[PDB]
């Protein structure tokens, strides 16, 4: 049913990304060359975010921001909203696709509740953050280098590492990777066959796994929870910056040249990074 | 049978002409003109 509601939209998003990465330019939006046509490589190419000349206007094809023209519609940078919006629509379509597959089979939908994490990550990073910001010009670009630039910008302007939510998201991602590796390794070790692994972990790690369903639930739950908390933290950054800044240490270090903490040096890096772009 | 013959003929007419159409589109001054991408000479 809904399995045909995402295929056209996902294919259009993919086609838009492919068209942008090789033909359109970011000269009139960022003053940069961001496609294969100009001479960029795979890492450099990016579907750049729209310029800071319209604000939050979506740059529709039939909208007066381009007036039906295509060269203008590409130069204004409407391809970024096009790609992002179609991708989000297709992603929620796949959410409903997993939902309806689970409904048809008759088992509890757990692939959908797991896939919910990427949905939150996408809607928070690419949609809600620019909405909370001035305009799309500060939204992340659809590129390998654009993502890194956005990451560094958020570090400079928010100290995102010091945020509890990114910390717990890092913990969730690394725990998911560890659990994946350990489950695969133990399965190929005992290759039932659970008593051997349980004894091995009881004697090695002490706190062994009660059941394989428990371990499977834990590896299902750790990374999705980490992603959800990271998305919630980004959304908070849009509304209310949740960074616990120890101003006591800041004042203690400002006028004492014999005191310093790595938090103080992180603050130094952040403020110098702010001052670097005027 | 004849169906495979027509399949091969249809796939032989189109693929080379499509590749060459792309090559012509980007070789001449069409890719820059349509997509708004500036040519390297105009850059300031």
């Amino acid at each position: 049913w809904s399995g045909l509601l995402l295929f056209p939209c996902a294919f259009m998003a993919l086609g838009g990304w492919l068209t942008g990465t090789t033909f359109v330019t970011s000269w009139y939006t960022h003053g940069l060359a961001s496609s294969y046509l100009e001479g960029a490589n795979f890492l450099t190419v990016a579907v750049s975010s729209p310029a800071d000349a319209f604000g939050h206007s979506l740059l529709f094809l039939w909208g007066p921001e381009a007036q039906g023209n295509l060269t203008r519609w590409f130069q204004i940078g409407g391809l970024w909203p096009f790609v992002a919006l179609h991708g989000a629509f297709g992603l929620i379509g796949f959410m409903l696709r997993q939902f309806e597959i689970s409904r048809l089979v008759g088992i509890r939908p757990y692939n959908a509740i797991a896939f919910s994490g990427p949905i939150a990550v996408f809607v928070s990073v690419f949609l809600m953050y620019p909405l909370g910001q001035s305009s799309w010009f500060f939204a992340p670009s659809f590129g390998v280098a654009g993502i890194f630039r956005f990451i560094l910008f958020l570090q400079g302007f928010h100290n995102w590492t010091l945020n509890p939510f990114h910390m717990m998201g890092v913990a969730g991602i690394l725990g998911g990777a560890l659990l994946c590796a350990i489950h695969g390794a133990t399965v190929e070790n005992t290759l039932y066959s659970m008593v051997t692994a349980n004894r091995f972990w009881s004697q090695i790690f002490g706190i062994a796994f009660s059941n394989k369903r428990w371990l499977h639930f834990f590896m299902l739950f750790v990374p999705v929870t980490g992603l959800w908390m990271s998305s919630v933290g980004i959304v908070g950054l849009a509304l209310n910056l949740r960074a616990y800044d120890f101003v006591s240490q800041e004042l203690r270090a400002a006028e004492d040249p014999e005191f310093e903490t790595f938090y103080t040096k992180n603050i130094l890096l952040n403020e110098g990074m702010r001052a670097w772009m005027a | 049978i004849v169906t495979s013959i027509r399949y091969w003929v249809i796939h032989s007419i189109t693929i080379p002409m499509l590749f060459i159409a792309g090559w012509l589109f980007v070789s001449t001054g069409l890719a820059y003109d349509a997509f708004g991408t500036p040519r390297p000479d105009e850059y300031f």
């Binding site: 492919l18 090789t22 294969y36 | 693929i15 499509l18 590749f19 159409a21 792309g22 589109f25 980007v26």
Partner: peptide
């Protein structure tokens, strides 16, 4: 159908790869 499911991806990909192949030469 499968026909569209394959052609909608095939018919622009050859055009695009030919384009990139030519761009691999248009560079001065």
């Amino acid at each position: 159908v499968r026909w569209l499911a394959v052609h909608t991806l095939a018919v622009p990909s050859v055009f695009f790869v030919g384009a990139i192949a030519a761009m691999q030469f248009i560079q001065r």
